[PDB]
Ligand SMILES: *Cc1cc2c(nc3c(=O)[nH]c(=O)nc-3n2C[C@H](O)[C@H](O)[C@H](O)COP(=O)(O)OP(=O)(O)OC[C@H]2O[C@@H](n3cnc4c(N)ncnc43)[C@H](O)[C@@H]2O)c(*)c1C
Ligand SMILES: *[C@@H]1O[C@H](CO)[C@@H](O)[C@H](O)[C@H]1NC(C)=O
Ligand SMILES: *[C@@H]1O[C@H](CO)[C@@H](O)[C@H](O)[C@H]1NC(C)=O
């Protein structure tokens with residue numbers, strides 16, 4: 001029943017499922033993935049249809065609270081909760097239907113996750129989509145912020161395949177969006193992050209699951225000087241040579257730097273591409289993984305222990321602080337400073353660990369870069385690099401130190417080594433790899449850069465009262 005919760009009373013009246021705060025359902029869906037930023041929602045609705053979403057939004061309006069859609073709950077700032085206490089949460093993971101038609105167009109409900117989605121696309125016509133590695137990630141949050149992975153260099157962002165959607169607006173209206181209908185909102189949904197509308201169903205174009213994919217890894221044994229020379233070589237290569245069908249990211253930690261990625265082709269061809277750059281990068285490295293497989297195979301290569309088929313039964317958690325950055329080609333100062341930081345300022349206590357991913361995001365032959373900053377809300381098409389910084393506390397159940405008090409300075413300083421060298425307008429961050437220490441003003445500029453003003457105008461049109469806003473989302477500001 002709706003004891004002590006007027007919103008639950010409204011939801012019950014609308015025949016919309018909800019979680020009582022004293023329930024196990026609340027324990028699961030009301031507890032953020034990142035326990036460092038767990039929040040307490042005002043209520044939790046569990047819509048099962050587009051109409052249910054609209055009814056729930058109306059209930060939130062009646063209550064005078066902000067409303068946050070939660071897809072897979074993998075946002076680093078817990079934006080499925082609104083990024084703070086007190087929002088009406090719409091847990092969408094019960095809405096995960098995936099259907100591929102005879103035109104190879106896939107309809108995917110707003111609460112579907114990557115793993116389940118990938119499986120369904122394969123089962124339904126051997127189709128594929130360009131998306132991240134984590135099977136638990138919600139398609140919703142993923143596409144709204146971009147959707148980056150080992151298929152991005154070859155097939156762009158997840159949002160580059162979106163052709164339409166059925167969404168619920170802040171006034172509880174239900175509309176369809178596409179490049180030809182409510183095109184401004186469609187543009188905003190493709191990269192604008194959260195707060196524009198609540199998506200009930202996404203419509204995606206798809207590509208045929210590749211017949212062959214070669215996954216690889218290069219393990220280096222580089223000292224400080226070699227790190228710098230290697231990164232400089234990889235940068236020139238990334239910008240002028242790296243082939244369309246190859247993806248790469250560098251996995252970096254206190255004692256290693258490994259290259260890894262997928263190649264939409266065979267192993268023999270891949271080795272002919274890697275050999276030259278391995279030599280140019282200064283040697284001192286070797287291929288540590290090189291195997292041909294298929295789409296299903298590559299997906300299962302980057303699960304890292306996570307279950308592949310996840311729907312509404314999800315209760316995984318971590319305790320960490322993350323950050324990100326996007327940037328153009330770097331000068332020697334940025335590279336040298338980054339390397340110096342790894343060697344001289346990355347010592348952490350036992351129980352704490354960190355890693356960084358240096359993503360080959362843009363470049364001449366990157367499909368992502370084949371789209372201009374004006375074509376979708378994604379605003380980093382001009383950036384060659386994307387980075388993810390991850391600061392984990394493994395024994396968080398026993399000790400979270402230095403968090404929650406401090407610790408942020410470690411990765412903030414790591415980001416600064418590179419960011420400080422960039423012109424103000426080129427400084428960016430990737431919303432899908434959120435930095436919780438940012439203010440709403442700072443976040444908007446870093447996450448959406450040159451597209452922020454347009455996004456704010458679109459936000460003003462579709463959600464003037466900021467009903468769907470979170471603590472760092474685009475604000476309603478008309479031009
Ligand atoms: C935990 C985790 C995150 C990952 C992982 N791997 C990634 C990868 O390989 N590539 C990436 O580009 N990103 C990866 N991420 C980062 C992010 O967690 C994701 O990219 C997504 O942002 C997460 O989506 P989701 O799980 O849906 O996040 P929520 O916290 O539920 O919401 C995020 C956000 O956007 C809104 N939103 C979600 N769903 C909807 C719908 N249907 N309609 C409207 N708005 C929606 C929220 O309101 C909020 O603002 C790997 C791992 C393990
Ligand atoms: C994934 O789990 C769902 C449960 O909702 C099930 O319906 C589906 O068949 C599973 N897919 C598999 C095992 O490929
Ligand atoms: C990084 O470590 C060096 C030690 O050589 C030190 O001089 C510098 O101040 C440190 N920078 C910080 C605190 O981020």
Ligand SMILES: [Zn+2]
Pocket residue numbers: 001002003020022
């Ligand atoms: Zn009760």
Ligand SMILES: [Zn+2]
Pocket residue numbers: 021040041
């Ligand atoms: Zn509470």
Ligand SMILES: [Zn+2]
Pocket residue numbers: 243244245
């Ligand atoms: Zn080629």
Ligand SMILES: [Zn+2]
Pocket residue numbers: 333420421
């Ligand atoms: Zn400088």
